[PDB]
């Protein structure tokens, strides 16, 4: 509550961290599926937080920079992702991509296409290798981890060993 009440006291990295947290809260509360960066810049509560003297010391570039860095923190955490689409400012929210969840679930249900003499289920890295071939070549470890956590929360998959998953 303190930082949010006086964000002008923060150094730029701390401010960027805080903006990223408030951006996450916005995206989750509104069940946003995809967004252009500029849409977050238009949320008054986010722009008011971001717009501190430290960002200014062009103006549009200063605002673009802090918002881009905040969104990238969410990307690094696997909460948002991009497609190879030529749209630098378009982002997708991992938790809202139902097709992605279903496809990862299917990969796991099918034991990552392993012959039936091998172990049921598959390792994180195997799932990732399959998903990059069949779904999205750029899929990060962090985005996959977020999908797996959601599937686990839904009791659709179970971890039987460290980083190893089978259908529930």
User: Where along the chain do its domains lie?
Assistant: 1-95, 96-168
Residue 114 to residue 122: CA distance in whole angstroms: 8
Q: What is the CATH number of domain 96-168?
A: 1.10.10.10
CA gap 112, 126 in Å, rounded: 7
Experimental technique for the deposited model:
X-ray
CA angle at 60 for the pair 5 and 51, rounded to the nearest 5°: 5
Question: How many residues can be counted in the chain?
Answer: 168
Per residue, what are the HEC states of the chain?
CHHHHCHHHCCHHHHHHHHHHHHHHHHHHCCCCEEEHHHHHCCHHHHHHHCCHHHHCCHHHHHHHHHHHHHHHHHHCCCEECCCCCCCCEEEEHHHCHHHHHHHHHHHHCHHHCCCCCCCCEEHHHHHHHHHHHCCCCCCHHHHHHHHHHHHHCCCEEEEECCEEEEC
Please check whether the two domains, 1-95 and 96-168, share a CATH topology: yes
Using alpha carbons only, give the angle 145, 150, 155 rounded to the nearest 5 degrees: 120
Write the CATH number of the domain with boundaries 1-95.
Answer: 1.10.10.980
Q: Quick one: CA dihedral 53, 56, 61, 67, positive or negative?
A: negative
Phi-psi region of 69 (alpha: psi -120 to 50; beta: other; left: phi over 0): alpha
Residue 145 CA to residue 150 CA, distance in Å, equals 9
Q: Which two tokens stand for residue 157?
A: 């998959």
Question: Between the CA of residue 83 and those of 99, 101, 136, 139, what are the distances in Å?
Answer: 14, 16, 8, 9
Opening angle at CA 147, ends 99 and 121, nearest 5 = 95
Mark 75-97 as b/e (b = at least 16 C-beta within 10 Å): beebbbbbeeeeeeeebbbbbeb
Query: Among 122, 128, 17, which residue's Cα sits nearest to residue 70?
Result: 17
Cα–Cα dist 141/28, whole Å: 21
- Give the Cα separation of 28 and 86 in Å (integer): 25
Residues 6+ apart with CB under 8 A from 123: 163, 164, 165
CA distances from 121 to 102, 141, 154, 164 (A): 15, 18, 17, 7
Resolution (angstroms) stands at: 1.6
Q: How far apart are alpha carbons 33 and 27 in whole angstroms?
A: 8
Instruction: Give the pairing of strands 80-81 and 164-167.
Output: unpaired
Q: Rounded to an integer, what distance in angstroms lies between the CA atom of residue 114 and that of residue 166?
A: 13
121 phi, psi to nearest 5 deg: 70, -170
Question: Does the CA dihedral 53-54-59-62 come out positive or negative?
Answer: negative
């Amino acid at each position: 509550a303190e930082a949010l009440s006086n964000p002008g006291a923060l150094d730029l990295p701390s401010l960027t961290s805080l903006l990223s947290e408030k951006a996450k809260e916005f995206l989750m509360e509104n069940r946003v599926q995809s967004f252009y960066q500029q849409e977050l810049e238009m949320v008054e509560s986010l722009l008011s937080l971001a717009n501190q003297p430290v960002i200014h010391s062009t103006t549009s570039k200063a605002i673009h920079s802090i918002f881009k860095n905040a969104i990238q923190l969410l990307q690094e955490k696997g909460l948002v992702f991009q497609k190879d689409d030529g749209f630098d400012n378009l982002y997708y929210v991992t938790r809202e991509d139902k097709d992605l969840h279903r496809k990862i679930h299917r990969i796991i249900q099918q034991d990552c296409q392993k012959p039936n003499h091998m172990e049921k289920g598959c390792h994180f890295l195997h799932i990732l290798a399959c998903a990059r071939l069949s779904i999205r070549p750029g899929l990060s470890e962090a985005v996959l981890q977020q999908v797996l956590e959601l599937l686990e929360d839904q009791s659709d998959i179970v971890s039987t060993m460290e980083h190893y998953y089978t259908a529930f």
